[PDB]
Structure formats: C-alpha cells, structure tokens
C-alpha cells in the first residue's frame, strides 16, 4: 500500500464515470479530439490549405463544416504547435491545418485509451475481453483511413477532413480515382456492415417476437426481471420459425452471439486492408481482359466500362478545385463530356 | 406468343384463386391457441 496502490485505489473507485489508469490516456485525448473538432468547425477556416470555407463563423452549416486537412505542401508533417511550421503561433497553426493533425493524433491516442478502458473494466468486473477485441475493427478503420492512407499518399491533404460533406467528398474521390467500389476488400466490408445490420435487425426482432408471456401487460418490457435465471424468449420456437421460413436457423445462442461479433468486425478489418492498398494506389481499378476487349471492340460495353467513364468525369471535373496545389488548368475543350450535357 | 399468354394467365389465375380461397378457408382458426 504505497503511493502507487493508493493511486490505483482512487482511479478504480466505483463512481459515475469510471476513470481507471486508462482514463489518464483516454479522457484528455478524447476531449481534445472532440473539442478540437467542435472548435475548428465553429471558428476555423480552410482558406489557406484548401481554398474552402469550413466553419460556422464563415457561413457553413453542420453538413458543410469540417476541420480540413493541411495543405499538400505540408507533406506528412506532424504540424506540432511548437513545430517549425507554426513556430508557436496558434493563429498560424489553425490556418495551416494544425488542428487536423491535432484531432487525428489525439483521436488516435484517445481510441487507444478507449480499448485500454474496455480491457481495464472487463478485468475488474471479471468478464472476458471480447468488447475490446471487437473494438479493434473501428481502430483498424481509423488507423488505415486517417493515418496509413495519407502516409502512403503525398501528404495529409488526401486524408479525410473531419466533416460531413468533407467525408462525402472522400467517398467520391475514392470512386473517381481508386474505383473503390470495385475492390473486393471494400465489398467484404460492405457485406460485414450490411450483414451486421441484418443480424442486428433479425436478432432483435426474433427475440421480441418469441418472448415468453411472463406478465399480464400488453407492453411486454415489464415482464423481464434483470435477475431472472430463465431465458426471456423461446430459442426452440425461434429455431423452428427460421428453419421453416429460411431453411437454416441458429440452435446455439453462444454461437449466434459470437457470429454477431464476427460479421461486422471481420468486415471492417477487410475494408481496412483494401484502404492500405489504396495508400499505395494499389487499386482494384481495372479488369485487364475487359480493357483489351473494349479497346479492340468498340461495340463491347459493360456496366464496368460505363463506370470508368463516370470515373474519368469525376477526375477531370473535380481535380482543379479538389487539388488546388497542383494548379490544374483544364481548358473547357479538354473536359470529357457526353453529348448535350 | 398468344398460346404463352393464355398459359401464363391460366397459371396466374390458378395460383391467385388458391391464395384467395385458401385465406377464405377459415384462416383465423388455424393457430395453436384459439382454434375457434
């Protein structure tokens, strides 16, 4: 019972918001990430890094505000406030996009603090640490998208800017430049997300519709008691319903709930790997056999060749303003267009 | 083409008739509790 054990006593007190040792990392890093985002979206411009207004103070709404990435000439600079770019000037640091790296780094260490908190509480309450393990998927996504992706690219400029429309641009950029929908790792991510949402909806509806009558109310929530040993719904009835509707059904509740962990976690991990490839421009952009055939046969058309024409439109129309460090002047006659439009 | 049209119409009518007459065949009573 030295000073360490006395400090360990206080950090793990049963209070309203648990602290723990992880709370030393989680709480300041998460609050600065959140507070940095709310600060930038309320007050900070993107005029010098992107040529964009991006705060409420400039006139943007909630959908259009962002803490935008630094200028492409920053490279992968950490953009520390005391670093050689800002040199301690907070105002210049904000104008250089120093808030973006502030949010991304405090957010990264905050996420590390959150998984440590999951591990710490699970160890203290005596449960298995599967919630910490499932949280590795959001960590893999944040690390691949906001860190590994721009680190493979020219600068932090091409990471997502922390904002709603800014994120939508990032989606459209990945379509037009990376053809990211064609990527099988993204497709595995889509199956994990939509499968997990299916599993969320299907499991919740099945439980709620195979409930045992454990009370007289027509509003059935009161008939559950948190200390009951018994199942509140009929696994046998649920199993027979789905076996006859759909052909298969869960018969093991433990496997069912593991599969609910597995599906969206595996999906997000799969999507992270595809983005790691896109950090190097290792895209699933084309199918070579279709390109050889289309180049020699001008009647050969698929939805895939149609999507590449859309991709070429996206690149030529968006690049001069989306990449204003390149100083793209595309004269109007060079622009790919269809007839009339 | 006319012969296909008459076949498909006959087939569709047959299955719609089974659905309608089937749900008219005392459907509320076909349940495990109140078989009234």
């Amino acid at each position: 019972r030295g000073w360490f054990d006395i400090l360990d006593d206080w950090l793990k007190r049963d209070r309203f918001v648990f602290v723990g040792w992880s709370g030393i990392l989680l709480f300041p890093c998460a609050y600065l990430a959140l507070g940095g985002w709310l600060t930038g979206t309320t007050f900070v411009t993107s005029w010098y890094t992107h040529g964009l207004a991006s705060s409420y103070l400039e006139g943007c709404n909630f959908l259009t505000v962002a803490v935008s990435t630094p200028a492409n000439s920053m490279g992968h600079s950490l953009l520390l406030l005391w670093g050689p770019e800002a040199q301690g000037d907070f105002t210049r640091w904000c104008q250089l996009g120093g808030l973006w790296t502030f949010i991304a780094l405090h957010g990264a260490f905050g996420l590390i603090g959150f998984m440590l908190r999951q591990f710490e509480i699970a160890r203290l309450v005596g449960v298995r640490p599967y919630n910490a393990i499932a949280f590795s998927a959001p960590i893999a996504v944040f690390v691949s998208v906001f860190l590994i992706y721009p680190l493979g690219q020219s600068s932090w400029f091409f990471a997502p800017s922390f904002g709603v429309a800014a994120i939508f641009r990032f989606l459209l950029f990945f379509q037009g430049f990376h053809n990211w929908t064609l990527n099988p790792f993204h497709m595995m991510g889509v199956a994990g997300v939509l499968g997990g949402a299916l599993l969320c909806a299907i499991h919740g509806a099945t439980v709620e519709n195979t409930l045992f009558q454990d009370g007289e109310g027509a509003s059935t929530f009161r008939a559950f008691n948190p200390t009951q040993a018994e199942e509140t719904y009929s696994m046998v009835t649920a199993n027979r319903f789905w076996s006859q509707i759909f052909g298969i059904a869960f018969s093991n509740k433990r496997w069912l709930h593991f599969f609910m962990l597995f599906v969206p976690v595996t999906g997000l991990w799969m999507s992270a790997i595809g983005v790691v490839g896109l950090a190097l421009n290792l895209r699933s952009y084309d199918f070579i056999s279709q390109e050889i055939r289309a180049a020699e046969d001008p009647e050969f058309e698929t939805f895939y060749t149609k999507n590449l024409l859309l991709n070429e439109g996206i690149r030529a129309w968006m690049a001069p303003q989306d990449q204003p460090h390149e100083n793209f002047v595309f004269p109007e006659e060079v622009l790919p267009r269809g007839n009339a439009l | 083409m006319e012969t296909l049209k008459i076949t498909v119409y006959i087939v569709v009518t047959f299955f719609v008739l089974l659905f309608v007459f089937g749900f008219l065949s005392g459907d509320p009573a076909r349940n495990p509790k109140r078989k009234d």
Partner: protein
C-alpha cells in the same frame, strides 16, 4: 431538492433547444451562408 417540477424543467429546456435550433435554421436563410 424538488422545488421546480421536472416536467417544467424539461419543457423549458426542450423549448429553448427548439428556439436555438430554430434560430440556426433562420440563419440558413439570412446573412452568411444564405447564398444571397
């Protein structure tokens, strides 16, 4: 302890939220960001 009833608190707090968000939607049509 319990001097102002909580339904009064919730109603006034819920109305001030409406007023402030309502001002935000008003500001979408006036001044900066309104396109005029």
């Amino acid at each position: 302890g319990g001097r102002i009833p909580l339904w009064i608190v919730a109603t006034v707090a819920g109305m001030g939220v409406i007023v402030i968000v309502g001002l935000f939607f008003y500001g979408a049509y006036a001044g900066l960001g309104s396109s005029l």
